[PDB]
């Protein structure tokens, strides 16, 4: 269902869905199983590009999140048209050796040609087996 994230841009992200999680309740990402994540956002600008930047933290310490496809245009219709709504469906496979944790803050910023497209932080992810 719909999950709660905190916006770090200008409210362009409208809804964020993770299968089988709800609101601000713990959302369990399983190691070694694909993680899927849908978003509904409004393009704040014309852009031919969309770059994903992830910073994530595990129990307060920064972590390099690997095997992330930075091109969001692989997961939505690009080019982007200013003022139109888009539906991105991103899929990232959690590596088996991904470290388990009950405290996980993830920041995702998407850059376009003319500036930040969208930004959100999520605090409720938990990594388990």
């Amino acid at each position: 269902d719909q999950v709660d994230v905190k916006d770090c841009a200008n409210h362009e992200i409208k809804k964020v869905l993770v299968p089988g999680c709800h609101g601000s309740e713990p959302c369990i990402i399983h190691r070694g199983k694909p993680f899927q994540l849908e978003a509904l956002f409004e393009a704040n600008q014309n852009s031919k590009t969309a770059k994903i930047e992830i910073k994530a933290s595990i129990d307060g310490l920064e972590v390099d999140v690997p095997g992330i496809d930075p091109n969001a245009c692989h997961y939505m219709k690009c080019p982007l048209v200013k003022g139109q709504q888009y539906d991105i469906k991103y899929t990232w496979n959690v590596p088996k050796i991904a470290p388990k944790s009950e405290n996980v803050v993830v920041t995702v910023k998407v850059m376009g040609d003319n500036g930040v497209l969208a930004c959100a932080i999520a605090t409720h992810a938990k990594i388990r087996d």
Partner: antibody
Amino acid sequence: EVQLVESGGGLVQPGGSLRLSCAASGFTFSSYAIHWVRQAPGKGLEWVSGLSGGGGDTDYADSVKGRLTISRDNSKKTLFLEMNNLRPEDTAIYYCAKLTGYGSTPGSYMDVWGKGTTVSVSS
Amino acid sequence: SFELTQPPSVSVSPGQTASITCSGDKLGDIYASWYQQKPGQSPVVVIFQDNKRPSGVPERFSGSNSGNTATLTISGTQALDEADYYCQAWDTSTSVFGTGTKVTVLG
């Protein structure tokens, strides 16, 4: 309800320094980026600096780059602008302005502005 | 940084429609807003996203951003509309403000 109150301007010699505060009230300060916009006497608006809600993203104008630094204290609900090595052309009234979001994007707009405080730099 | 050019002044008769223009190399790729600064007061937003008017701002105010030119349109200009008008747009992280168009109503 939403209010910003500036202070710290003054007569300063070239090369002098000032610290500007902007004291906010009536909104969750930390949820919103706040920016400085200056205006020389009888002239137009010039953007100076901005800062995301978390204090993460400092951005400056090439004109002020290197001599000004922007900062927040969220507990105190206050935005600061430390101006050093000031120059005459930096003489103007300095407004702080709340954005509509946490971060500067193309859609962002300045929805609230203080009454301003006046900086004058002269020999 | 990119530059937004506005006419230096626009004079209008009471009840005439004023038309302030703001031009930039690629502005239809971005959003343009408009601020009104009456003498001795702080700026106030009147149009926020090309064609969007804040609740509170009078219905007479309208906007557009077609052709790489943003256009504020005050219909039925009154003596209250008599102020300096500044367009604004983002050069990524930099807020670019226009030169300024002083609207006078000949009353």
